[PDB]
């Protein structure tokens, strides 16, 4: 019953235009699933809340997904290692998504996301196009109440530590 | 019944001299458990096989643990991103442990270990003293037959790809 998946990267290059509600498919890419499309779908399943705790976040596809969730009324909170001050984090911040951050020293090295306080997405993968398309990486997607509890506790500790006020 | 733990880092600094069978405790460090001691114990529980697939590996404590397992007759196979050509990987290689490697370009970005084809240890953590003592990181320790199967399959694919012959 409970979701337990693992995605291995590098991801196959596939079309995500419909998934990401592209404005305006006739493209040449495969229209089938990949590790990236599976990750996107896990995130886009969010109806209530998304916590993101990511060392690095520059993927425009993943940025678009998070944008759409914010536009849908999902409560999005993001922690990254760098403040990123046309970056994705810059665009998320401009859209009104709360982003808190570390010293850009390497210290905040988690790569996880929590969807609706019920699904934990966690791996070796930094959310960058370079890593997604080129690196050997893993991302776990788990509906596990204890892991979600413990990761949400960690998230909230880091969230409060980085409160700009 | 099945093990499902998560270790969060940075690790408390605690004594590991007895655990790592130090030659020759009167030290000033706490003699209690930490995220690092828990990781060490998970590895040292190996009786048969250890597969390590690690972006970076420079921790002398973790190096010592792997050494001891090799000396105990455990079948140790290591994949790292860099060839490391007094490094830990150098010392493991000299001791007769088979190490295979990537291009030192960032591509081999996993941070996992498989103990006795039954426990998967996987996280955000690179096995370096700097990361262990300073970074916010997670390491999962899971007795999960499907995750172990799929991670062992991935390991073997990478192992064969990097066969020096
Ligand atoms: Zn298309
Ligand atoms: Zn001691």
From Swiss-Prot, chains A, B:
A GO molecular-function annotation: protein homodimerization activity
Repeat keyword on record: no
This protein's record includes keyword Transmembrane: yes
Protein family per UniProt: Belongs to the phospholipase D family. MitoPLD/Zucchini subfamily.
Function field: Presents phospholipase and nuclease activities, depending on the different physiological conditions. Interaction with Mitoguardin (MIGA1 or MIGA2) affects the dimer conformation, facilitating the lipase activity over the nuclease activity. Plays a key role in mitochondrial fusion and fission via its phospholipase activity. In its phospholipase role, it uses the mitochondrial lipid cardiolipin as substrate to generate phosphatidate (PA or 1,2-diacyl-sn-glycero-3-phosphate), a second messenger signaling lipid.
Domain comment quoted from the record: In contrast to other members of the phospholipase D family, contains only one PLD phosphodiesterase domain, suggesting that it has a single half-catalytic and requires homodimerization to form a complete active site.
The protein's name: Mitochondrial cardiolipin hydrolase
Organism from which the protein derives: Mus musculus
Lineage, opening ranks: Eukaryota, Metazoa, Chordata, Craniata, Vertebrata
Gene that this sequence comes from: Pld6
Residues of the whole record sequence present: 35 to 209 of 221
